[PDB]
Design a protein around this ligand. Structure first.
Ligand SMILES: *[C@@H]1O[C@H](CO)[C@@H](O[C@@H]2O[C@H](CO)[C@@H](O[C@@H]3O[C@H](CO)[C@@H](O)[C@H](O[C@H]4O[C@H](CO)[C@@H](O)[C@H](O)[C@@H]4O)[C@@H]3O)[C@H](O)[C@H]2NC(C)=O)[C@H](O)[C@H]1NC(C)=O
Ligand SMILES: *[C@@H]1O[C@H](CO)[C@@H](O[C@@H]2O[C@H](CO)[C@@H](O[C@@H]3O[C@H](CO)[C@@H](O)[C@H](O)[C@@H]3O)[C@H](O)[C@H]2NC(C)=O)[C@H](O)[C@H]1NC(C)=O
Ligand SMILES: *[C@@H]1O[C@H](CO)[C@@H](O[C@@H]2O[C@H](CO)[C@@H](O)[C@H](O)[C@H]2NC(C)=O)[C@H](O)[C@H]1NC(C)=O
Ligand SMILES: *[C@@H]1O[C@H](CO)[C@@H](O[C@@H]2O[C@H](CO)[C@@H](O)[C@H](O)[C@H]2NC(C)=O)[C@H](O)[C@H]1NC(C)=O
Ligand SMILES: *[C@@H]1O[C@H](CO)[C@@H](O)[C@H](O)[C@H]1NC(C)=O
Ligand SMILES: *[C@@H]1O[C@H](CO)[C@@H](O)[C@H](O)[C@H]1NC(C)=O
Ligand SMILES: *[C@@H]1O[C@H](CO)[C@@H](O)[C@H](O)[C@H]1NC(C)=O
Ligand SMILES: *[C@@H]1O[C@H](CO)[C@@H](O)[C@H](O)[C@H]1NC(C)=O
Ligand SMILES: *[C@@H]1O[C@H](CO)[C@@H](O)[C@H](O)[C@H]1NC(C)=O
Ligand SMILES: *[C@@H]1O[C@H](CO)[C@@H](O)[C@H](O)[C@H]1NC(C)=O
Ligand SMILES: *[C@@H]1O[C@H](CO)[C@@H](O)[C@H](O)[C@H]1NC(C)=O
Lengths: 75, 108, 553, 637, 75, 75
């Protein structure tokens, strides 16, 4: 997905955190596929978000949470 | 009045968007029925018509918030399915005070 | 002629029996309404000069008292006071805004520090919000208001996607166009679009596919099959003769829409018969003015002339880099120049390899600068008791510390009762002191207009206190172990941030769009984007420095 | 443990000299110092024995801080980088960007922070002290620490009479091998250990002779003994038991359900040593808007006590009013006027779900029985008993009966126990005896404190408190940091009944106070000093006469008469059409003739039915001007 | 000098230390009020000739919007 | 409230004009009590509070007319 389809909501209480520490950084595809395989191993997590920490890579796992705006033009 | 479904179950189940009742319903009725759909869905998903999830607790934006029904005096809040969807406090206070306090004592 | 949605003929004379009309877009109509408002609030001011109407007439109009020309001993329509009175009666709120803009325009136009004073337009008041359209007439996905500093994001035709509002930010808002919104809607909650709206089947519902720019891709695929779709909005491109393989090019179906009078651009597209792309030189059927376009007829802004066949030849065949297409624009005819899309500015002085990523989208202003002066430029000309200029940075530090001790570097302003602080000092003292205030540090709740920031900064709080402290009395730093002088320009001027580029150097730039982020293959050094040196490589935007690669120098 | 500033201050105090060094907390000299009523101040360097070299009479306008003093010393290498205010930045770097470290606004370097380049997550004082206690520093009980690296306002050394002698047991070692979660099991494993709690400074220094309380572990019967270990004693529920018991004991003391902030400590220190300037506080625990010195210089400060440099007035009240609130809404409405052709009242999801719903209405107004101070006391109670949303969540998903809630939060129905002065706080430095001064010179009224404590005890048994606290958990975090901020905001939204038009500009005075008449769209009305229109004052034409003293008194007396028994009657003043007092204002059988603004005339008190000859307002003004002129005739020269 | 019934000094400069004032009658005061109205409605017309004020100013005054000289960039 | 005569018999017998209750009553009360005096006098003279004589039947001018009391519904 793209960052334009995201609403920030810090009140969610159904999420997990996982740091991956690397100073001399590996290929970002490797840690990306590792976190995707980690969510693939489980069944409850449906959304995986990767963010670049200064000393690590933060993988955040969420259940499917959406905010829908319904109107007479477009949902 | 030709229908058998009254206005609350008209709006909650969303009659104005039906293909059968195509042009019979106005536009503001079609928006209000969408808001009442969102209320009933948010209830039967989470348990609170203001929030779609049990854990999100984001501020509602689609309509005005629906207050809880505290049973004592000073509250007893209820939603009104009007165009603006306002909040009120007393529903039939004189009539239910007659039918509960007085006439039950007269019955005994 | 052109018509409204509800069967109403728009304002404008009917087109000639063999003459193509043009209908404005959704954004263009609203821009015409805003220009109508500006014209009316100018004509009220022009009436106010001529003294043609009494002062209490509008008070009677507001109170509801309406006197006709017969009641005042007048011919029935010799003074057009009826239309002037009806101007204040096409609404309440529109009338109050008309009165406010008229009062402002009259008082400023007749007191813009005139011939009896200096001038220079110190107030420099910005007009109302006029919407910014696309090249064709559709709404731009981000609208920015220069007066306050808001930059919200609109829908396809209306406005204000809720929650998308931002105020005084360095980063441009990233909100999706009409394709990507429906794309994420179809991917997330399966709210797909319909191929044909009359009576669809579940085979007719598709999740749309967008390009990297944002527009619709050419071939949409559903469960039933594939078809060709209009790139602007997602309806069936050729509802009569749709073909999956080798779908028709834009020029041919556009011309078919023009001749069938379903689309009104005002002209007929004369495209190339070879590939179906646009020939460079489409123009009006009445020969008149002619121009040049990029692909999809996007109207190169700098080439429209009344001369026959404006020369817009293809440039020299080698390109500065193997990326062939210049992003957002083209080179028109080093015998040629570079011109790009509407509402975009070339960061480079030619408007010598001309870079592909050479123009971006301009942003609002970000810093406000003012300056003050002293006569300690040279030691023997003032009472510093020295004749040495070898150390002067220590004096700069001492003056800055004395200043920030006496306020003067953290302006305090009220917000609904409670005070807030805004820093205005970083290496100001040079003597010359230069207060440079960052707009992002100032909130939107306090100082809600840029001119309010100018009033609060040049006013009593900072620049009123400074001149009072210097000219009356002295604050003389001892240094035992300053000279007063006029500044010749004691006024605000806006400027971009450290990483960006100030494109229109005239501070009188309307619509407040003078800051452009420094592009991909360049670095900002002296408020100018210099292309990166040969041995180095740059991959950020607004990066301030360029990075070398060891492998493959 | 006393700093050089404190010992210099006490030595000058014991000599009864003309000068004592003014000494702010964290053992630091104030950058401005004066003699005791000597009226010639000066600005002093870092060690307090210095002088800027030019002592002016009265307060100096401003002067350089320790940052700028050290900087001017080094210029006249390494450059000490400082912020706008007088405090060293938490990252200090060399002038070449090769080495950076952390300081604590006094200069000495934290040992571990020295490294190449810029550091991230600079440790603060609590983490430094808590790590030092694992490196051999004497006290082996880790001080109680917040979520960030900051000391809790209320701390507990928690160990006394270890092996029959009074010192601190090795608590950081003690907690780990023996898992205690239950007070009865704790005394079974470790008897004769009683919790010694107090409250601390900003640096964590224990307050002198105040709050040194001891608590007995025997009384409490434990609830919530089905949870895992929380990895830190500060995260154990026993620490909340001790903190709630300590705060409940200090509720009847000091009039406040908290340890006092920086304002009260500075004010008490200034009053005790007799400093020429004492800060002026208020109920919540912040510096007041106007803070003058003893006679001459009056000026305004922020919430941290730093002087706003451009408001020193020298005798005149500077009047940086927080009630001065027009210009914001004025320029907001003016900006909304000039948009195009397209703080606040209250946060949006609060008024409909809290105030109008009927949740705060029994909380503060249903039993609003002489509780002017008790609303701030209730804010402190909500902030202190529930310090985080998670603990309130746990308390609300365990306690299914509101009757038992006080048994699970406080010390086993401790509250009625501290309603009748039962003893669990023996052997402490506060008390030993019984208008009345407090622990820090607070004005105490014991029956108000006990009545409010019983009211809070009764309120904590209410299920509507449980529902309100569910709703207060459900608020988003951006509106309010803690539950006390939620409680403050829901009090603030009681007067947020404002749905104004977009373009109503509020006209207001040159100094910015609201004009007495506000007009829009052909209507006009009277407003008070706050932005609420007076009910019924809206007029169709324009220019309403705003009501005088007589009309406000008549409305107030009529409204108060509306809730009173039948035969009882009160004094309702009778006014003219324009609003002046009627010349004879009469009561039960005694008619007196008033002069003006409700002030009775002596010598005219008489029975009803006797005809009067009370003077006209001409003779009233004749008397007033006659007295004015004979007083002015008594002029000295 | 002359005074109103409710102890208010009427408009007019105070008479000289030895100079007799004159106070208007009940009718004469009302005639002075009518002449005041005539003078004001003449001075509004004289202002209207000189084009010294904008046309929409009185509309803003009627609607309740009052802009001071500072808001219009004026002394 | 210090009096024992209530408001109707205060106004009808005309307490506000008494020399005993000299300044205790407002001016509009003094006019209203005069109107109520005229009502009660017109009643006890003729029989109808609108007319002072049984034979005059001129239109009342001092106050608003006092309608009769028809006993049925609607009146
Ligand atoms: C929708 O609802 C369903 C119904 O509840 C739900 O399915 C359940 O999910 C839970 C997830 O915890 C399952 O519980 C697991 O069951 C297995 C059975 O073998 C246990 O072994 C698990 O324990 C271990 O699992 C891993 C094994 O390697 C270990 O890594 C881990 O550490 C545990 O020790 C665990 O208890 C449960 O069996 C299902 N099914 C039912 C019928 O309850 C589903 O997850 C919900 N969500 C979605 C998106 O469908
Ligand atoms: C982590 O490992 C350490 C290893 O030292 C554990 O410490 C040991 O814990 C046991 C159980 O609490 C202690 O036994 C106790 O001995 C006393 C002696 O009088 C006895 O009275 C008790 O009944 C109990 O048996 C043991 O002394 C202690 N060893 C030490 C401190 O060296 C620790 O418990 C482990 N962590 C946890 C959480 O258990
Ligand atoms: C970074 O490292 C990963 C992990 O080795 C590389 O991923 C491999 O890529 C090749 C071809 O792209 C595949 O055939 C392998 O299956 C991938 N996985 C592994 C485990 O080898 C990746 O190519 C590296 N380089 C980058 C991202 O530039
Ligand atoms: C004052 O305190 C003592 C000790 O806390 C109270 O004695 C307890 O009283 C309760 C019932 O009132 C008994 O159930 C306990 O067994 C008592 N002993 C304890 C807790 O050790 C005493 O009642 C209090 N005085 C009052 C309430 O007036
Ligand atoms: C009015 O218009 C004339 C020209 O039409 C211009 O010279 C003048 O400056 C304007 N303003 C005033 C106040 O007369
Ligand atoms: C450069 O672009 C051309 C496209 O015309 C392509 O054929 C060629 O392979 C490209 N060369 C490199 C090195 O990318
Ligand atoms: C700005 O001021 C800082 C603070 O002393 C100084 O270190 C720096 O060299 C100055 N110049 C620039 C360009 O940052
Ligand atoms: C200071 O300002 C004056 C006037 O703006 C200018 O002439 C002078 O060169 C400036 N000094 C420096 C060092 O730039
Ligand atoms: C202040 O004291 C420190 C050590 O106590 C000393 O190093 C420093 O020189 C002193 N500064 C003075 C006396 O100005
Ligand atoms: C001046 O007169 C006032 C008025 O009684 C008196 O209080 C004061 O003491 C007098 N001062 C002197 C110096 O006489
Ligand atoms: C305005 O005044 C001038 C002289 O002051 C006069 O000649 C003229 O007739 C007046 N009216 C107009 C409409 O100019």
């Amino acid at each position: 997905l793209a960052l334009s389809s995201v609403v920030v909501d810090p009140s969610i209480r159904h999420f997990d955190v996982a740091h991956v520490s690397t100073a001399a950084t590996s290929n970002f595809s490797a840690v990306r596929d590792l976190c995707l395989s980690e969510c693939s191993q489980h069944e409850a997590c449906l959304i995986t978000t990767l963010q670049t920490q200064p000393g690590a890579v933060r993988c955040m796992f969420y259940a499917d949470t959406q905010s829908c705006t319904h109107s007479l033009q477009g949902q | 009045g030709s229908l058998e479904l009254l206005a609350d179950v008209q709006f909650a189940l969303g009659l104005p968007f039906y293909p059968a009742y195509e042009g019979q319903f106005s536009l503001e009725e079609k928006s209000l029925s969408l808001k009442i759909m969102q209320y009933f869905s948010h209830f039967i998903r989470s348990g609170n018509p203001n929030y779609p999830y049990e854990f999100s607790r984001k501020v509602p934006t689609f309509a005005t918030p629906w207050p809880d029904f505290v049973p004592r005096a000073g509250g007893e809040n209820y939603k009104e399915f009007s165009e603006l969807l306002p909040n009120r406090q007393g529903l039939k206070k004189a009539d239910c005070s007659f039918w509960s306090k007085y006439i039950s004592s007269l019955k005994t | 002629w052109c018509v409204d949605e509800a069967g109403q003929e728009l304002e404008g004379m009917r087109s000639e029996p063999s003459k193509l009309p043009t209908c404005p877009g959704s954004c263009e109509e609203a821009k015409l309404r805003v220009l109508q408002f500006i014209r009316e609030t100018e004509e009220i001011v022009s009436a106010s000069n001529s003294s043609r109407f009494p002062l209490g007439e509008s008070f009677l109009v507001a109170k509801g008292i309406r006197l006709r020309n017969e009641d005042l001993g007048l011919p029935p329509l010799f003074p057009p006071r009826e239309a002037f009175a009806e101007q204040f009666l096409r609404g309440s709120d529109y009338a109050i805004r008309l009165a406010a803009q008229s009062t402002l325009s009259f008082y400023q136009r007749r007191r813009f520090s005139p011939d009896d004073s200096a001038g220079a337009s110190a107030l420099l008041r910005s007009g109302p919000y006029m919407p910014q359209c696309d090249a064709f007439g559709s709404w731009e996905p981000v609208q920015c208001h220069a007066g306050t500093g808001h930059c919200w994001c609109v829908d396809e035709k209306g406005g204000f996607i809720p929650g998308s509002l931002t105020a005084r930010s360095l980063q441009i808002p990233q909100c999706p166009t009409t394709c990507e919104k429906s794309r994420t809607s179809g991917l997330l909650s399966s709210w797909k679009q319909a191929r044909s709206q009359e009576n669809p089947s579940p085979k007719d519902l598709f999740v749309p596919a967008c390009l990297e720019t944002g527009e619709y891709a050419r071939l949409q695929a559903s469960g039933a099959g594939t078809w060709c779709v209009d790139p602007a909005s997602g309806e069936e491109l050729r509802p009569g003769s749709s073909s999956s393989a080798q779908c028709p090019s834009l020029c041919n179906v556009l011309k078919s829409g023009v001749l069938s009078r379903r689309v009104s651009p005002g002209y007929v597209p004369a495209c190339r018969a070879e590939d179906g792309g646009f020939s460079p030189v489409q123009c009006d059927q009445a020969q008149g003015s002619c121009w040049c376009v990029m692909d999809s007829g996007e109207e190169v802004p700098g080439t429209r002339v009344t001369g026959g066949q404006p020369a817009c030849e293809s440039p020299r065949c080698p390109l500065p880099f193997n990326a062939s297409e210049v992003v957002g624009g083209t080179i028109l005819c080093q015998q040629c120049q570079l011109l790009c899309r509407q509402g975009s500015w070339s960061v480079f002085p030619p408007g010598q390899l001309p870079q592909p990523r050479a123009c971006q989208r301009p942003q609002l202003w970000q810093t406000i600068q003012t300056q003050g002066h002293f006569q300690l430029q040279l030691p023997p000309g003032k009472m510093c008791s020295a004749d040495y200029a070898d150390l002067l940075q220590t004096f700069q530090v001492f003056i800055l510390d004395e200043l920030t001790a006496r306020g003067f570097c953290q302006i305090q302003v009220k917000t609904f009762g409670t005070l807030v602080s805004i820093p205005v000092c970083n290496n100001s003292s040079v003597v010359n002191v230069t207060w440079k205030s960052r707009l992002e540090d100032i909130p939107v709740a306090s100082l809600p207009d840029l001119h309010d920031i100018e009033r609060a900064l040049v006013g009593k709080d900072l620049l009123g206190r400074f001149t009072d402290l210097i000219q009356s009395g002295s604050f003389q730093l001892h240094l035992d172990s300053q000279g007063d002088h006029f500044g010749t320009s004691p006024r605000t001027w806006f400027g971009c941030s450290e990483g960006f580029y100030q494109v229109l150097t005239s501070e009188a730039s309307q619509d407040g769009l003078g800051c452009v982020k420094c592009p991909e293959g360049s670095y900002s050094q002296d408020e100018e984007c210099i292309p990166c040196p040969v041995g180095f490589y740059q991959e950020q935007a607004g990066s301030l420095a360029c990075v070398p690669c060891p492998v493959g120098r | 443990p006393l700093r050089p500033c404190e010992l210099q201050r006490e030595t000058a105090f014991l000599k009864q000299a003309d000068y004592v060094p003014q000494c702010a907390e964290d053992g630091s000299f104030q950058t401005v110092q004066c003699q005791n009523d000597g009226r010639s101040c000066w600005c002093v360097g870092a060690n307090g024995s210095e002088v800027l070299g030019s002592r002016q009479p009265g307060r100096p306008v401003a002067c350089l801080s320790f940052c700028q003093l050290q900087k001017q010393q080094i210029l006249l290498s390494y450059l000490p980088q400082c912020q706008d205010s007088g405090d060293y930045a938490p990252v200090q770097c060399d002038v070449q960007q090769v080495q950076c470290w952390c300081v604590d606004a006094e200069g000495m370097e934290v040992y571990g922070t020295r490294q190449l380049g810029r550091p991230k997550r600079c440790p603060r004082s609590c983490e430094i002290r808590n790590r030092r206690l694992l490196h051999g520093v004497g006290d082996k009980s880790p001080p109680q620490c917040s979520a960030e690296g900051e000391f809790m306002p209320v701390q507990c050394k928690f160990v006394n009479t270890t092996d029959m002698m009074i010192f601190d047991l090795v608590h950081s070692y003690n907690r780990f091998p023996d898992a205690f979660v239950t007070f009865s099991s704790f005394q079974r494993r470790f008897p004769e250990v009683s919790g010694y709690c107090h409250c601390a400074d900003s640096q964590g220094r224990e307050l002198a002779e105040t709050g040194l309380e001891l608590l007995l572990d025997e009384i409490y019967d434990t609830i919530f003994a089905g949870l895992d270990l929380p990895s830190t004693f500060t995260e154990t529920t026993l620490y909340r038991i001790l903190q709630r018991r300590f705060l409940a004991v200090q509720s009847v003391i000091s009039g406040r359900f908290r340890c006092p902030t920086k304002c009260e400590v500075e004010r008490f220190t200034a009053t005790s040593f007799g400093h020429p300037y004492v800060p002026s506080c208020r109920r919540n625990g912040d510096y007041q808007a106007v803070q003058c010195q003893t006679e001459g210089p009056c000026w305004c400060v922020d919430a941290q006590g730093k002087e706003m440099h451009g408001t020193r007035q020298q005798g005149e009240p500077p009047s940086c009013a927080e009630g001065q609130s027009c210009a914001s809404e004025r320029q907001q409405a003016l900006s909304r006027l000039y948009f195009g052709t397209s703080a606040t009242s209250c946060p949006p999801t609060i008024k409909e779900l809290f105030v109008d719903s009927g949740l705060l209405r029994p909380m503060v107004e249903g039993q609003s029985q002489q509780f002017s101070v008790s609303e701030n006391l209730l804010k402190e109670a909500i902030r202190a008993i529930f310090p985080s949303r998670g603990l309130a969540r746990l308390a609300l998903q365990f306690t299914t009966n509101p009757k038992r809630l006080q048994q699970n939060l406080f010390g086993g129905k401790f509250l009625v126990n501290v309603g009748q002065f039962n003893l669990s706080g023996a052997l402490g430095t506060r008390g030993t005896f019984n208008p009345t001064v407090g622990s820090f010179g607070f004005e105490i009224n014991l029956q108000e404190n006990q009545n409010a404590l019983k009211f809070l005890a009764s309120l904590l048994e209410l299920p509507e408190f449980l529902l309100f606290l569910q709703h207060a958990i459900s608020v988003p975090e951006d509106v309010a940091r803690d539950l006390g901020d939620v409680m403050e905001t829901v009090l603030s939204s009681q007067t947020c009944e404002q749905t104004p038009e977009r373009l109503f500009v509020p006209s207001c005075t040159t100094e910015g106070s609201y004009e007495d008449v506000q007009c829009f769209s052909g209507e006009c009305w009277c407003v008070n000093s706050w932005g609420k229109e007076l009910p019924g004052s809206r007029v169709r034409g324009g220019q309403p006469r705003c009501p005088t003293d007589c009309e406000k008194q008549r409305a107030r007396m009529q409204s108060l008469m509306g809730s009173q028994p039948a035969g009882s009657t009160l004094f309702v003043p009778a006014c003219t059409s324009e609003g002046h007092f009627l010349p004879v204002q009469c009561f039960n059988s005694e008619c007196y003739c008033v002069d003006a603004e409700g002030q009775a005339i002596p010598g005219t008190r008489s029975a009803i039915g006797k005809p009067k000859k009370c003077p006209t307002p001409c003779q009233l003004q004749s008397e007033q001007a006659f007295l004015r002129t004979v007083q002015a005739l008594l002029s000295n020269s």
